[PDB]
Amino acid sequence: GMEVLDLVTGPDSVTEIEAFLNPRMGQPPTPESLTEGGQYYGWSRGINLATSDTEDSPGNNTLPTWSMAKLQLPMLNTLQMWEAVSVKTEVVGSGSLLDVHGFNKPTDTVNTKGISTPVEGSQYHVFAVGGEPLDLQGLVTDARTKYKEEGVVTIKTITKKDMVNKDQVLNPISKAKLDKDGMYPVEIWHPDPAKNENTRYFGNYTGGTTTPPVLQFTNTLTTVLLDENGVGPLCKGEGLYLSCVDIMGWRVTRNYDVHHWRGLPRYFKITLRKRWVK
Amino acid sequence: GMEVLDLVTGPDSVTEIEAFLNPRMGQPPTPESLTEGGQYYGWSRGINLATSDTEDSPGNNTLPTWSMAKLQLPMLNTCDTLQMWEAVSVKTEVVGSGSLLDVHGFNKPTDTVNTKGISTPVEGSQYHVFAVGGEPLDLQGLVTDARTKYKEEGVVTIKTITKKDMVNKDQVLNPISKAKLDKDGMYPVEIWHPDPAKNENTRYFGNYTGGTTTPPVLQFTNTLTTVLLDENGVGPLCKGEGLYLSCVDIMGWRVTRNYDVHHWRGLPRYFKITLRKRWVK
Amino acid sequence: GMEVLDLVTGPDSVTEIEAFLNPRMGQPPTPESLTEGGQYYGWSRGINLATSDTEDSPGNNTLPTWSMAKLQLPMLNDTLQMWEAVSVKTEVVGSGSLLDVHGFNKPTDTVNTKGISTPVEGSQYHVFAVGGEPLDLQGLVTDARTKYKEEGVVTIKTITKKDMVNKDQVLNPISKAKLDKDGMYPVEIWHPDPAKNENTRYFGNYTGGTTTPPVLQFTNTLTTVLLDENGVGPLCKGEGLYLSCVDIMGWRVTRNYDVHHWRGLPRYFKITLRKRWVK
Amino acid sequence: GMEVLDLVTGPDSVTEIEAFLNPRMGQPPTPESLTEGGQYYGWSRGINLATSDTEDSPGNNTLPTWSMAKLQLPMLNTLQMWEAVSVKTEVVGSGSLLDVHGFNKPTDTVNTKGISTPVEGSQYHVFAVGGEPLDLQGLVTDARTKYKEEGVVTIKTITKKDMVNKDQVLNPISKAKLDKDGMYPVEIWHPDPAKNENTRYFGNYTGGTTTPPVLQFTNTLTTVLLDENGVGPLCKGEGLYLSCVDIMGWRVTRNYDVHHWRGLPRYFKITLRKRWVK
Amino acid sequence: GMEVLDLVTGPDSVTEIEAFLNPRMGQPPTPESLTEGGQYYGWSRGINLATSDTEDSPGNNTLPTWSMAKLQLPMLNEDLTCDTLQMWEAVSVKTEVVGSGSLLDVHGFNKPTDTVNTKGISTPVEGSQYHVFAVGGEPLDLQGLVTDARTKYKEEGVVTIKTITKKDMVNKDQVLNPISKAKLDKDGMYPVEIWHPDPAKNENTRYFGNYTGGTTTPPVLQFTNTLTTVLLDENGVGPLCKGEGLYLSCVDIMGWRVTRNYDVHHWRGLPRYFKITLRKRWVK
Ligand SMILES: CC(=O)N[C@H]1[C@H](O[C@@H]2[C@H](O)[C@@H](O)[C@H](O)O[C@@H]2CO)O[C@H](CO)[C@H](O)[C@@H]1O[C@@H]1O[C@H](CO)[C@H](O)[C@H](O[C@]2(C(=O)O)C[C@H](O)[C@@H](NC(C)=O)[C@H]([C@H](O)[C@H](O)CO)O2)[C@H]1O
Ligand SMILES: CC(=O)N[C@H]1[C@H](O[C@@H]2[C@H](O)[C@@H](O)[C@H](O)O[C@@H]2CO)O[C@H](CO)[C@H](O)[C@@H]1O[C@@H]1O[C@H](CO)[C@H](O)[C@H](O[C@]2(C(=O)O)C[C@H](O)[C@@H](NC(C)=O)[C@H]([C@H](O)[C@H](O)CO)O2)[C@H]1O
Ligand SMILES: CC(=O)N[C@H]1[C@H](O[C@@H]2[C@H](O)[C@@H](O)[C@H](O)O[C@@H]2CO)O[C@H](CO)[C@H](O)[C@@H]1O[C@@H]1O[C@H](CO)[C@H](O)[C@H](O[C@]2(C(=O)O)C[C@H](O)[C@@H](NC(C)=O)[C@H]([C@H](O)[C@H](O)CO)O2)[C@H]1O
Ligand SMILES: CC(=O)N[C@H]1[C@H](O[C@@H]2[C@H](O)[C@@H](O)[C@H](O)O[C@@H]2CO)O[C@H](CO)[C@H](O)[C@@H]1O[C@@H]1O[C@H](CO)[C@H](O)[C@H](O[C@]2(C(=O)O)C[C@H](O)[C@@H](NC(C)=O)[C@H]([C@H](O)[C@H](O)CO)O2)[C@H]1O
Ligand SMILES: CC(=O)N[C@H]1[C@H](O[C@@H]2[C@H](O)[C@@H](O)[C@H](O)O[C@@H]2CO)O[C@H](CO)[C@H](O)[C@@H]1O[C@@H]1O[C@H](CO)[C@H](O)[C@H](O[C@]2(C(=O)O)C[C@H](O)[C@@H](NC(C)=O)[C@H]([C@H](O)[C@H](O)CO)O2)[C@H]1O
């Protein structure tokens, strides 16, 4: 699989596959009930704050995590491998943020009037396509943060030891692979630029508290995945890995300004071709 | 035909058609009377808010919906090889942003201490989408709140399609919740989004900018052409000579002097589409 | 001028002309006196507000209007010649003047009446057009009930001889005009008509809000090509060249009841034209 | 130098020259003393306001003016002229705006705490390179403004008459040339688009009062000065004119919100070549 | 070293080297203890303000400084007297600021957004941002320029204009004073509010910078592994590594966090990754 040779031609030598990845903002897909917690699906549960400089214990369901899927491609086997050539990707549903008729904190709080404040604030959009899991590099705001041990994969899960001060900057010890959906918090785990030779990733961040969310969408834009040498990600064991996170901001409730993260689903249409290798 | 062959040449092989789609912000075109509701045409009616976490029922006339039109093209159709109209390009323009420079009206004023200043111009969340295709725009439903009590008359919602109430998956991507944009002023834009899993025969282009007092921004020129050809050089092909135009152009809200009532503002969109005849098999 | 043929060659087959159009924000150029109203030239007079939901009567001098000029080109004439507008270099001049924050506007510290004189801010509108005939206009208003003056401005009612209808708040094809007079057509009413203007190129942008920072760029190195997809620029009917524009920078605000005055800036045009054979 | 002919080849036919222009925000370079006014060098003195609608008398040291320099090129004389082909220009010192530890108006005025508010507000960046002085067109906010007669060059300096109402728009009578450093106020004098055939200028303006200042800087960007015919500015009598202004905004003091303009220096590196002319 | 000739071909004629530079916002990497000050690593200590117009004495640990590293490349010339030599040439760099996602932590103990009830969210990092990186074949040349020539910077612990000149700053140091120059030859020592890339030098370095000001400005960052910055000049020549030394320099300030105690601000910085492609170049 090391030496990359000619493209393979002939029947079924090119394929397209599509997938959507639902966001993982904190509330899991179940319970489905719209009274017992399912009404928060697509959102986090209410963000809970530290009680002191030394007591920061966020709930698992308040922490957005990476979405990921591993897709199995047609069996193939000088061997052949599937090569990801390009991707059309789209974040769906920004129009739903035009709902300003709900029960959020209103724009006129004196009289409880105006409109229901739309989703605003910090936004984070990353997607990746690769032929193996996305390589992750840990880096946190606060190495003292007391993440739960169960239900979430954090730096301590990997090292078996408490975070160190270097984890607030770049600590090469704190690395992982995005091998599970809805488990790796995005406030901890970042694409690792020192690895990911077989993955392309693309991200942006906009911060603030009331920042207007911005999003574009079209079915006419293709992201090429080929590297400088004309070679796309090569799918080891015919596995294709898709990873993303799409945070639009928070809604704010009428009770103590409780914030809920809002995420939106991402569509992928990947074009792949067979490549000779040895 | 599924197989796309050569361009047709000769007399009348290329045509240009134009249309404007008026916005559908909530108030219908009629009554025309400027005292009986017609004064809100181009706008929504006053946005009504939920009364609790479990009671959110927006008025239909408070919900912007998609604009659409189906235009009939000239009839077409050895008779073993057929012809279809192919949409090559579109010049499209949102008209009327200058009208937002009216700051002399009776909106909430900028100085509420003296009730002075200027009439606050339209501001806030903005949403601009257009599409051109050879069949209706494919729609994917996704809502803020699956508990929202959308009206069961006068509007097409997820429940219209499924015959069942919305579920938690409708707040993310639920592949069951799909529709086609086959009616003007009927599909709310807060529910129905272009479906990237379909629309093989339509090109769509959209953007969203949120917030409450965000300055609206717009550009307009008659010098810009959008090419509609795909990677293979093939534009949307008009099934049964029908051309579908879809759009929505929300500029923000105006706010009244009475308990900050908000009204959505929309603007009309112009389309000039160039089509050519294409041989198909 | 139906069929467009070869370019004309030879002596004086290419020409260049320049003009500036001063803004039309509401105060006319006269009286010139700086105590009798001339001090507002380049600005509107104080924006006056509706007194009810059914009583909106703006003063003519509070409404920015389109600037326009028709320039006469050198006389030319089966096969005739027309002047063809090839490109334009255009610039909005004087943004540096907005750096005057030492005047008597509403100050930045209203608590103590201190700080600086608040600079021009808010809603901005920049459009220019170059064509071989008047700019085609499409009417569209915020409020079809607005009571524009009958004299002194050209409005929808001027054209139709009838009151505005609700369709005038969206696209009503009946409500059309031509930009044939300077300082007469309000920009909150009259927009470039995308369904016409085959022989004019226009370019516009809008940024709204109340305190939005104005933005402007300027350079003498930027050329706007006016040729269409077929390589044909606007053709000047009867050797007339039409220039149209509006350049609103925002408002200044006074210390008296937050009265707003629109601010506009002049626009420079330098048009390159060439002779074109036509049949 | 009427007709422009071929490029001159051979030894020393191409030259590079560099210069920095310090900003002229209102306080002159002297006195140097940091207690006698020198502490304001790089800044204006405190902006003074009109006392009524008819009494606007700005101090000279509150008005930013154009920076300019005339550089002498190697002597040359079918004659030859120096042709400016390109310029690399940069505004230096934006990092200094990261000083938020001084005694400006603080971010928390309720308690007088936080940080020293950094420079913010209206920004103005223009540079020009030409073979003769930059041509200026006058245009003011207020034709009634009572500028000082001595110490600044204003419209009245040129016309010998008071400003007229047309000076608030485009009045072709009100023209000048940028022939002195630190003398022509930028709120009065603008690049004249009806002239400047032998100069290239590039400008932008961003307004507001608390607007975040933005600046990019790199040594990898070249501005080509050649016109549509491949001809750059031709230096009359071997003189090269550099003109600029780089306003970053204002700092605000803790005393009645007094504002001081902040300017930054601009670097220029001009490439010139010999040109045959007739 | 001066005259640039053909590219060298053959085995190991092209190489790639990578490095990360951690931010230098004010708190040093040690002590490591999360109770003794290590909890501030990645941040400045609390910004302290002037007490009058003539008394501005910032603490060293409140001043972000330039990050830098010198990488030693494989030696090329056994004999420097040969009429033709080889040098490493930096062709391009992939660079990335890592960890912006960590700013999505709004669950800590910063000043909260609901100050009436002490609720809402922990206010995220906001405000003034500064991103510069450089790659060159010798130290980055620095030009001094300060807000206030009266600022009483410590004499020990930071390299300032006075460190270089041995004299107090002059009023000209508030604009361009060509006397006030230095080289970025040490990590975590040169304050970024004092020292700027010198556009009059740096012939053998490429630098790229941007500044965004304000106090509550939303921070913005992009990251991808698909973006290459080309380092070749107008003649097709990249930085040439003098004595095989490659210099990397950067600063990446994201803004401040604000505490619940007197709105004390702490600068936040993020690390920067570099992957530099270099090739051997014949020179004489
Ligand atoms: C219901 C509750 O209080 N849950 C606590 C939880 O308390 C458990 C148990 O449920 C409770 O009966 C018992 O008295 O105490 C035990 C143990 O303490 O304790 C956990 C910590 O272990 C949490 O503190 C939890 O509180 C929830 O925490 C979530 C974050 O993990 C989140 O903040 C919840 O906030 C929301 C929510 O997302 O559910 C915010 C939301 O806006 C609210 N919705 C509305 C319409 O107001 C809801 C709502 O108040 C509650 O869900 C109850 O209907 O809370 C927070 O409750
Ligand atoms: C007129 C009214 O009260 N309408 C109610 C409606 O009341 C019905 C019935 O129509 C009415 O004649 C009767 O008195 O009572 C019954 C039942 O109570 O009930 C419906 C059902 O939900 C609505 O509540 C309706 O209220 C209107 O709802 C609209 C949204 O669907 C919108 O919010 C209307 O608000 C506006 C408007 O857009 O018309 C907002 C606008 O800014 C206002 N304009 C001005 C100049 O003030 C108008 C204005 O108050 C009224 O239209 C004048 O009657 O209302 C809202 O009225
Ligand atoms: C002076 C006045 O109030 N004028 C009215 C006008 O009244 C006329 C006549 O002029 C007056 O002497 C008489 O008492 O009444 C008659 C008829 O009623 O009536 C018209 C309507 O037909 C207007 O209401 C007009 O008021 C002016 O309207 C302008 C817009 O059309 C504008 O708002 C004027 O406001 C300014 C101005 O732009 O001139 C705002 C400006 O900021 C002010 N300048 C300063 C330094 O304060 C001036 C200034 O107050 C006045 O011009 C007095 O010198 O007013 C508005 O006055
Ligand atoms: C010192 C003073 O009052 N200067 C006046 C000047 O007064 C002269 C003379 O100096 C004075 O002793 C005498 O009593 O009166 C005469 C003439 O009346 O008069 C001129 C007009 O001719 C000015 O009004 C001047 O005031 C200064 O004007 C500057 C603008 O030209 C500027 O606003 C000055 O404001 C600053 C400054 O820039 O120097 C603003 C600055 O933020 C302040 N610094 C601090 C740390 O507070 C300083 C400071 O207050 C003074 O410099 C005193 O050291 O003032 C303004 O003073
Ligand atoms: C602790 C203190 O006051 N330190 C002073 C320092 O005082 C030393 C000595 O530590 C102290 O015991 C004694 O009273 O006096 C000596 C000598 O005077 O004096 C220096 C000046 O020489 C400083 O004034 C220092 O104060 C610290 O200054 C830092 C900037 O250099 C910074 O502002 C510190 O502020 C923080 C911090 O960054 O550590 C801000 C931070 O948000 C705070 N964290 C929390 C959770 O509140 C901490 C915290 O209050 C202190 O570290 C104590 O735990 O302070 C500032 O303290």
Author numbering:
A (entry chain E), D (entry chain C): 33 to 109, 116 to 316
B (entry chain A): 33 to 109, 113 to 316
C (entry chain B): 33 to 109, 115 to 316
E (entry chain D): 33 to 316
In the authors' words:
Murine Polyomavirus (MuPyV) is a double-stranded DNA virus that can induce tumors in newborn animals. Viral attachment is mediated by the major capsid protein, VP1, which forms pentameric capsomers that assemble into the T = 7d icosahedral capsid of the virus. Sialylated oligosaccharide receptors are engaged in a shallow groove on top of VP1 formed by loop structures on the protein surface, similar to other polyomaviruses. The differences among the three strains have been mapped to amino acid variations at two positions, 91 and 296, within the receptor-binding region of VP1.
We solved structures of VP1 bound to the glycan portions of two of these gangliosides: The GD1a glycan is an established infectious receptor and essentially a truncated version of GT1a lacking the [α-2,8]-linked Neu5Acb in the long arm. Neither the longer E91 side chain (in PTA and LID) nor the shorter A296 side chain (in LID) result in an altered conformation of the ligand. GD1a binds less well to all strains compared to GT1a. In addition, there are differences in binding strength among the three strains. PTA and LID VP1 appear to bind GD1a at the same level and better compared with RA because these two strains gain additional interaction surface and van-der-Waals contacts from their E91 side chain. This might facilitate attachment and productive infection by these strains to cells that display GD1a, and may thus give them an advantage over RA.
